[PDB]
Amino acid sequence: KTRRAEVAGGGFAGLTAAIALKQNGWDVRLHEKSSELRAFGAGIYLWHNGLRVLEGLGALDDVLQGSHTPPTYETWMHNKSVSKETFNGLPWRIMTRSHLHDALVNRARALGVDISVNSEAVAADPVGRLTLQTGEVLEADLIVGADGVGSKVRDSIGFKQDRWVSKDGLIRLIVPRMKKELGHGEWDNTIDMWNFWPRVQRILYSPCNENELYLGLMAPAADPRGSSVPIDLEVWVEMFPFLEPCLIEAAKLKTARYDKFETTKLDSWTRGKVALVGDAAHAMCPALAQGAGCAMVNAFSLSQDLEEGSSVEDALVAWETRIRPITDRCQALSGDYAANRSLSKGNMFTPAALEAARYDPLRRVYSWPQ
Amino acid sequence: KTRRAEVAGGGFAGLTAAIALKQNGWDVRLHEKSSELRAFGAGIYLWHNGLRVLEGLGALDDVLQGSHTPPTYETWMHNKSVSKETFNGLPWRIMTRSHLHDALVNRARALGVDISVNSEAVAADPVGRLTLQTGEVLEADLIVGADGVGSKVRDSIGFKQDRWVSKDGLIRLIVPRMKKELGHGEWDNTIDMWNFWPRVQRILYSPCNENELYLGLMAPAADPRGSSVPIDLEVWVEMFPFLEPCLIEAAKLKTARYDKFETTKLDSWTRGKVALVGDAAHAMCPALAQGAGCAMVNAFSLSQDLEEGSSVEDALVAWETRIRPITDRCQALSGDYAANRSLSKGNMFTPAALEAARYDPLRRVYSWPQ
Amino acid sequence: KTRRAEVAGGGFAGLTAAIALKQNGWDVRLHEKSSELRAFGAGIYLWHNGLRVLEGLGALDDVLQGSHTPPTYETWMHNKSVSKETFNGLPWRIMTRSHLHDALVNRARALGVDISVNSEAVAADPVGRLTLQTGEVLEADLIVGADGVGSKVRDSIGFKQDRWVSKDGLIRLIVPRMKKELGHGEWDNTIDMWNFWPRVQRILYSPCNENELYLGLMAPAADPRGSSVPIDLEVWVEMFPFLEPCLIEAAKLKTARYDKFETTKLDSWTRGKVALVGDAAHAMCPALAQGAGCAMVNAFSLSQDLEEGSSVEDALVAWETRIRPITDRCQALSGDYAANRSLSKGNMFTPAALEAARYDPLRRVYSWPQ
Amino acid sequence: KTRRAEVAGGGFAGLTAAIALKQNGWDVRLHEKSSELRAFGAGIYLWHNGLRVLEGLGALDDVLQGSHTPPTYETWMHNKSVSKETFNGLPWRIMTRSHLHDALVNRARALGVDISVNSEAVAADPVGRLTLQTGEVLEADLIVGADGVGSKVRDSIGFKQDRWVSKDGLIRLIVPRMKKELGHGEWDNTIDMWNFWPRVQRILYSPCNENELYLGLMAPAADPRGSSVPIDLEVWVEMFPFLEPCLIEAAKLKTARYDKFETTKLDSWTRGKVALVGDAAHAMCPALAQGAGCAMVNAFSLSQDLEEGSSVEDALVAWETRIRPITDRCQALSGDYAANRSLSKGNMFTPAALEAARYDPLRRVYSWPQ
Ligand SMILES: Cc1cc2nc3c(=O)[nH]c(=O)nc-3n(C[C@H](O)[C@H](O)[C@H](O)COP(=O)(O)OP(=O)(O)OC[C@H]3O[C@@H](n4cnc5c(N)ncnc54)[C@H](O)[C@@H]3O)c2cc1C
Ligand SMILES: Cc1cc2nc3c(=O)[nH]c(=O)nc-3n(C[C@H](O)[C@H](O)[C@H](O)COP(=O)(O)OP(=O)(O)OC[C@H]3O[C@@H](n4cnc5c(N)ncnc54)[C@H](O)[C@@H]3O)c2cc1C
Ligand SMILES: Cc1cc2nc3c(=O)[nH]c(=O)nc-3n(C[C@H](O)[C@H](O)[C@H](O)COP(=O)(O)OP(=O)(O)OC[C@H]3O[C@@H](n4cnc5c(N)ncnc54)[C@H](O)[C@@H]3O)c2cc1C
Numbered sequence A, B, C, D: 001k002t003r004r005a006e007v008a009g010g011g012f013a014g015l016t017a018a019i020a021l022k023q024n025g026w027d028v029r030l031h032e033k034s035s036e037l038r039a040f041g042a043g044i045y046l047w048h049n050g051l052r053v054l055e056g057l058g059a060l061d062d063v064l065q066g067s068h069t070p071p072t073y074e075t076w077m078h079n080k081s082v083s084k085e086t087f088n089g090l091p092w093r094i095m096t097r098s099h100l101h102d103a104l105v106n107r108a109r110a111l112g113v114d115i116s117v118n119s120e121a122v123a124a125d126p127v128g129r130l131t132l133q134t135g136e137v138l139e140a141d142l143i144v145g146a147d148g149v150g151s152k153v154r155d156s157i158g159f160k161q162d163r164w165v166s167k168d169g170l171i172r173l174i175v176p177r178m179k180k181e182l183g184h185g186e187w188d189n190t191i192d193m194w195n196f197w198p199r200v201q202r203i204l205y206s207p208c209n210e211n212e213l214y215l216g217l218m219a220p221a222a223d224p225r226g227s228s229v230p231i232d233l234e235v236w237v238e239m240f241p242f243l244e245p246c247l248i249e250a251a252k253l254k255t256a257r258y259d260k261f262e263t264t265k266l267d268s269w270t271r272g273k274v275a276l277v278g279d280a281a282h283a284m285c286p287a288l289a290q291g292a293g294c295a296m297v298n299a300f301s302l303s304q305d306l307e308e309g310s311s312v313e314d315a316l317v318a319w320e321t322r323i324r325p326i327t328d329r330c331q332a333l334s335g336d337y338a339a340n341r342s343l344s345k346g347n348m349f350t351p352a353a354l355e356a357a358r359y360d361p362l363r364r365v366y367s368w369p370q
């Protein structure tokens, strides 16, 4: 009589789903393909919507401890400050990926979610069968495809989809704050430092706490120096001379990668007892920093619709219908912003842009009016 | 079998108590002595702790709509900016008194709390009798003394107490923002503008929204010009020339008052079926802006301890024991700050100062670590 | 026994020569081709070297009255201030062309220099004959070719020369200061506002006094909108939105012209009794603002070498040899700066750049060390 | 037939007089009471009027080399910048006393002025006799009393006079610039840092060149800590924390003195062949920094009136009548400013205040209109 859930993927969407289900009394197993539990991408921004999921999950406290809300979100064009935005009090937070990952993992273990590493889902059956690459076949009343842009839960079933892998990307790193060495300035701020002249180079400057700074170094793939890993110090120091102490530390990082952006969109998110969540269903452009946020919201809302006493198949359909438009709208707007370079203008966190952040999954309303 | 509560006082503490009790299924009546429901004091700051009570009460949304979180809390000494503080993301909000009052009243009516105006509690009996000035005697399983610094619920029973009414005070007003007329500056900020030379004059500058600015004009009682109502425009414009457009509007206000500060402290907050909440029990200095906050927290926590299935008498005792030390500590620290003029130094919203704001009544933990 | 000088051209170089000669007791006539005495180019910067000539000429006082030394010389790149320079006290001054012109004309009339308008020099003979377009032939012991880049005194004799007329230019205008309307800023500054993105547009912002602002609007000839006269308001307001009140006034000016830069360099400046001064001999790029300065210095120094009791032919040769290298060096450096866009970097008024300004013609030394 | 001048005092006024006279062909001797030629007072401000005297004296170049014109003259009240003034281009300069002293001494020796140290004038006779403390009696056609506030040339003759020695004073020092250690700011500026709260303490911050900073530390005599020598570091660092690296160096200075202000005014400046110049005749308050300036102007103008071919007695009378009102007006205004603390308001270098600086002794007109 205990409902059994099998979750594929140990990213933010999967740990979120697993926790939310385990809290509602599901018997939950989670399968991570990688040989250990880890998050990639250096750092991450969360907002009101995502922090509310964390609250719902019983993991907000561990997240807030040792993370950072900057006094302001600042934008520069050609070293000239063009905007400072605080979103009329709307909560937000910057942290390392590991930090967010550890909190979710620790919460999941505390609740006794069963976790398997080196455990890859290769096939899913909408009647509630999951097949692992070991050949083990698992039965469950619910299957969660949270297995990322390359989701095998998705693709073994067949979902009508558009996927795009961009040619351009960025280099994400964590370095020491070097705050004293930076000298005079507002170095606790989020600072988005755009340039088109003399070259197209941009740094997103993002403190995670008193010790760790998150840097996104962005330049087109066609620029050999800017796209270089480990970082071509000279060309980054040249256009960002004030960040030299941090850029120096960044250049020691041999594991730096130039990762490319990637998006996915599906005509639907469910089939029978199978639900897709996160990048598996809706990877989007980084512009509004809502990829993990939407993923977590949708994962948490999935647990919610499963508490209505309908069949799992009906709940999944009601779930998509309820929650999806927020994601579609955010994905679209984020892609638009990316393509138009809209953030470069500053003051672009309009009410529409913040619609996803403003959403409170817990009470299913929009908060923090702008 | 329905528990019956009688609440004396329609201030923030009383509306909070009434709502929280009505939500838990209490049959609730609230008695306001004044001939109509109204809040005095122009404007008010709330923090995380208080916003969480609002959430608990189902009234946060109406409060957030049309109120304001400044981008920063700034301090000036002699027109020189000495600090900017954002409390590492800790939520806060500025609003007019009416705004907070209307939200609570509207929520209370929506839940069907019975409200009586021109209804003054003059005597309370710890066995659960309340006597109104009309001579009507009401029975209830719980009596809430939320009737302010001059609480008759308190004094008709007899509580060992220290009360202090200060000689000094301030003039609190709401005027138009006049934002364009203010010209260049950071006019959405909270700005606490201290001066000791050439005179002791201070303005707390506090935007409530795009339309309404909340001003606290502070000068010692012994200064005839500064303490004057309606405001002596010349002496305020002189030391605050940049606020002239607002000060001009303020000087039209004939209802301006120089109210004095007032504190109360009691050796205990309960007797039998009677609980004291708010200024009735713990009026404090304005320095940490936590008078209404502590009041609301304590009122909401009272509802909480009444859900443990113990007698009302045991619940009230467990309530005080649980929640009081936060208030005692905040009151004390606030008085210290007031006396030492500690806020004038800037950067004084230390972790200890923010202890009350950091408290989350809903989950009974401290959040937003500093 | 009274020495007789004939001067061709009523620009700054010619009025300077005429005055300096008349002060030393020369009988002086000056011939202006144009039908009236007037100066074109809206505004002008002078420096120490040029102000010392003015002093020597007895015309400094009229110049200082109603002109302007900005508190600082500021440079912007993409609306970001990149330098502020004050040249370690070295005197400088901004004024309208008319202002400088009127002072020289008034001084020349006061000394009784004979001035003829509609009087064009078409031929000069190194034995001391000047022919006017009326056919009048004048004899003199000295002939001054101060007749501009198209000097007929020069060309009727034949001077080995390189002349260059550029394709690019700028629009020079005088408009009201509109200082209040500009609002917050440092609007008494000289501000050199460079941009390469999103277009190559630059404004030199140059207050002449409390009433008059001198604007240089620079854009390549190949840009149809930027090079347009009267000014294409939209494309200038777009990249210089903070100057809108002035740009609005500027757009009313129907007489605005897009003048092109022009340079001249000759293997020598003298022949017999004929000397060439100013643009006739050494027109240069505008970068170091030393065209009129060098012209005036060289014109004043010519008067100086004529007081040594040598023949006029020997004096002219000693004159060139003495004074020319300063001009050659300044011309060259200015052309270099122009071509490299060196001023865009800011802080480029190095000691070498200021070498011409630092020169004191009166005492024949370099002053104001850097 | 060679006119013979005897000058008492080797300060700025006496060296100025001596040089100016020696240039006009006077046979000049100068008597310095002190055992060596030296100037006290750490640093000094000069202006247009004084720099023109230097020019007239043939000593400007040595002065400009290794001295400093700040980009701006800034005023602070309670660490808040209240004004920045550049005097519409009017020349000025800051330098150490020694620097100004050495230039004058070197020029005087170069011209062959005869200089005697340990040579004190004790008596002067208006018929042209000077008596040295050695008992040597010198005859001359002119006697210059440039022997300071305690002038024996003055007092041995008897001049109706008011002298005032104030109770308050200041500590003048030269320390290293420590510019890097000062960090962010405008550290080449003259900065006049006023405070009345929490104490009456003021620093005049005055860079002399890239190596040397001139500091005036001012506090009332009645403050034991502020008036202390060597400096009470703690009380100066407390109110000027940003100057700590310099204040630290200043506290090593054992020769620091708290000198008091002193003024003198006489009903006349001449008697027969005797003229009084400088502090001997017109010591004034430091406020407009024109004590040495007026002294030098008056000393230089004395040489001027001696070239009119009248008797020395008539020239001296014409001299006083011509030049004195500028000094009387400047002295008076400076005393007013001192008493009213007028400079503390900022923007107080009005046209009237700058009247002395604006005066050009060389051409006997006022320049640099404001
Ligand atoms: C440059 C960049 C910046 C971004 N910044 C932000 C930001 O600031 N804020 C924000 O909210 N979002 C941000 N995002 C987006 C965010 O990173 C993603 O939306 C989010 O991490 C998606 O998480 P997920 O769990 O759905 O997928 P993933 O994080 O990809 O996780 C799935 C986990 O899947 C495991 N796995 C894969 N296949 C299998 C399988 N077959 N079986 C079992 N396990 C499997 C994967 O290995 C991994 O362990 C950013 C994205 C990019 C590219
Ligand atoms: C200058 C100043 C600034 C302040 N700023 C802040 C701030 O920024 N943030 C903050 O949180 N707090 C602030 N406070 C404190 C805050 O105002 C109080 O702590 C709060 O309003 C107390 O509310 P209460 O409901 O307990 O009492 P009250 O607001 O006094 O309310 C009781 C209500 O009691 C009614 N009543 C009285 N007697 C009877 C009776 N006998 N029978 C029936 N009804 C009765 C009263 O008339 C009224 O309607 C400030 C206080 C001052 C003085
Ligand atoms: C855009 C721009 C900005 C500049 N800015 C500065 C600056 O800020 N500071 C500075 O010092 N310099 C500046 N200059 C350069 C400066 O304008 C010239 O160097 C200066 O005006 C040359 O003066 P001139 O008297 O030699 O020649 P002109 O000013 O050309 O004067 C000669 C006069 O010659 C008359 N004339 C011509 N032919 C005859 C003839 N045949 N017979 C009789 N009369 C004749 C001309 O009509 C006119 O009246 C700038 C130049 C440009 C192009």
Ligand SMILES: Cc1cc2nc3c(=O)[nH]c(=O)nc-3n(C[C@H](O)[C@H](O)[C@H](O)COP(=O)(O)OP(=O)(O)OC[C@H]3O[C@@H](n4cnc5c(N)ncnc54)[C@H](O)[C@@H]3O)c2cc1C
Pocket: D008, D009, D010, D011, D012, D013, D014, D031, D032, D033, D034, D041, D043, D044, D045, D046, D119, D120, D121, D122, D146, D147, D148, D149, D150, D151, D152, D153, D170, D260, D261, D262, D277, D278, D279, D280, D283, D284, D286, D289, D290, D291, D292, D293, D294, D295
């Ligand atoms: C705090 C302070 C700050 C000041 N700042 C400035 C400033 O910034 N700019 C400015 O222009 N002015 C300033 N002044 C004023 C300026 O210092 C004086 O006006 C100036 O130094 C007067 O010079 P003097 O040569 O007349 O007298 P002194 O400098 O006193 O010189 C006379 C010389 O007299 C020698 N002597 C004295 N008696 C005899 C004698 N009997 N026989 C022979 N020799 C004798 C003295 O010993 C000395 O060598 C300031 C003054 C003060 C107090």
